[PDB]
Amino acid sequence: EMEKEFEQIDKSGSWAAIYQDIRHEASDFPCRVAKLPKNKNRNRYRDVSPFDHSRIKLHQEDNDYINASLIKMEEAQRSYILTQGPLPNTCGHFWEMVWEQKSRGVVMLNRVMEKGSLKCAQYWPQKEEKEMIFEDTNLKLTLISEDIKSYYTVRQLELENLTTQETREILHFHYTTWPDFGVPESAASFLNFLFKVRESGSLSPEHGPVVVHCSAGIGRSGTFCLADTCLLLMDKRKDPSSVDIKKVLLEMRKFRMGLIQTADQLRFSYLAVIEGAKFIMGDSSVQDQWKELSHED
Numbered sequence: 001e002m003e004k005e006f007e008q009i010d011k012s013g014s015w016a017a018i019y020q021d022i023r024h025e026a027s028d029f030p031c032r033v034a035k036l037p038k039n040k041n042r043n044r045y046r047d048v049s050p051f052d053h054s055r056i057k058l059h060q061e062d063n064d065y066i067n068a069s070l071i072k073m074e075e076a077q078r079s080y081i082l083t084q085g086p087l088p089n090t091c092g093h094f095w096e097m098v099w100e101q102k103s104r105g106v107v108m109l110n111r112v113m114e115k116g117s118l119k120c121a122q123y124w125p126q127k128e129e130k131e132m133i134f135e136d137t138n139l140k141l142t143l144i145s146e147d148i149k150s151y152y153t154v155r156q157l158e159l160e161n162l163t164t165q166e167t168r169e170i171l172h173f174h175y176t177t178w179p180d181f182g183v184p185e186s187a188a189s190f191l192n193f194l195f196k197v198r199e200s201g202s203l204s205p206e207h208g209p210v211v212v213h214c215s216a217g218i219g220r221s222g223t224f225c226l227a228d229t230c231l232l233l234m235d236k237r238k239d240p241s242s243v244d245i246k247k248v249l250l251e252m253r254k255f256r257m258g259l260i261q262t263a264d265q266l267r268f269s270y271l272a273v274i275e276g277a278k279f280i281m282g283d284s285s286v287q288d289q290w291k292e293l294s295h296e297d
Contacts, residue, residue: 001241006270019263022246026253029053039065042093044084048216054255056081058093059100060137066093067217069256070209071225076232079209080225082256084217085110085120092134094123095141098170098211099161105171105202107212109220114180119215124157124172138162144169149296151177151185152193154200173197178220181261183268187275188293190268194228195279195287203228222259223269226252230273234280245270 009015033039034049042065043049049067050056056068067090068083081101085108086094098106110119124141125132131142140160147154155172175193177185184190197203202210214220226249234243249266253259260266278286 002243002245002270003274006274009267015263015267018246019260019266022249022253022260022266025250026257027250028257029254031055031257033065034067036065038063042087042090043067044087045216048084048218048258050256056083056097056101058096060096066090066097068097068211069217071252071255073229073251076229076236077205078203078229078232080228081209081211082217082221082225082259083211083213085213085215086123088121091121091123091132092137092139094211095134095139095159096137099139099159099168101211102208103170103202103211104168104204104207105173105197105200105210107197107210107221107224108172108174109178109212109214109224110180111176114215119180120213124155133162151175151189151294151296152196154196171200171202173200173202175220178214180215181219183223183264184272186293187268187271188290189295190227190272191276191279192287192290192294192296194224194231194272194276195290198228216258216261218256218258219261219265222249222252222256222261223265223272226260226269227272227276230269231276231280234273234277238281240277240281243273245273 029051031049031051033052050069054069057064058066068081071080112120125143128143133140140162142158144156144158153174157170157172158167159170160167212221230243234240
């Protein structure tokens, strides 16, 4: 059981070994398409590639490659698309993926600039009056509104398929204070953010899979997805004891490599699931407490 295991690991100071045990057991599958020379400029990082078997294919006859993975969680009945922060040449591909996969939400866990370097392209419009047109994929993207809180921002976007003139509302959930290779400032603020994504409908089965991304789409993105799936499994059984976080993480790593990039992100995922468990087990009041402790304004 996870809280007992948690302490045990803390008392023995063996998070580094626990986490490397996961690295050692993690699945290895080919990433042949990702490594084709014609795709070198579609990958942000050399060592982070989607497996062929789970990669998202773009619906274009030209080149269907995007660095993005479908993480399909069978028992939990939730899917996520994890992808890298779009590149200046893949912003069109990114929104084509959102359209074709029928996603409702995009979860962004990074800032455009971190540690003095550019982690992600400016792939959405920052001003209502300056909409973006992606000419390669024939899509139009308009900022409709923005709700800025102290550590995250929610944007309503309108995505238009210029070829058919259909339009969809996309919700952009932007966590702005989660450090590159780091952990959130508290269990509360992370959980407050995840539940605001949940409350929006964008994780719902009537929509396509939520699109989750950081710079590489494995570390912060993996933490977010792992905590959500753990909480959902606990919910379906009302049985915190039945949820094995390491096994859940190993199952996710069948669909994309490298999920959870540090031992402290693993430890933080335990923290988030344990705390989140209070809400799942019937204490509705904790949600409000997280909101207060998060200091969102």
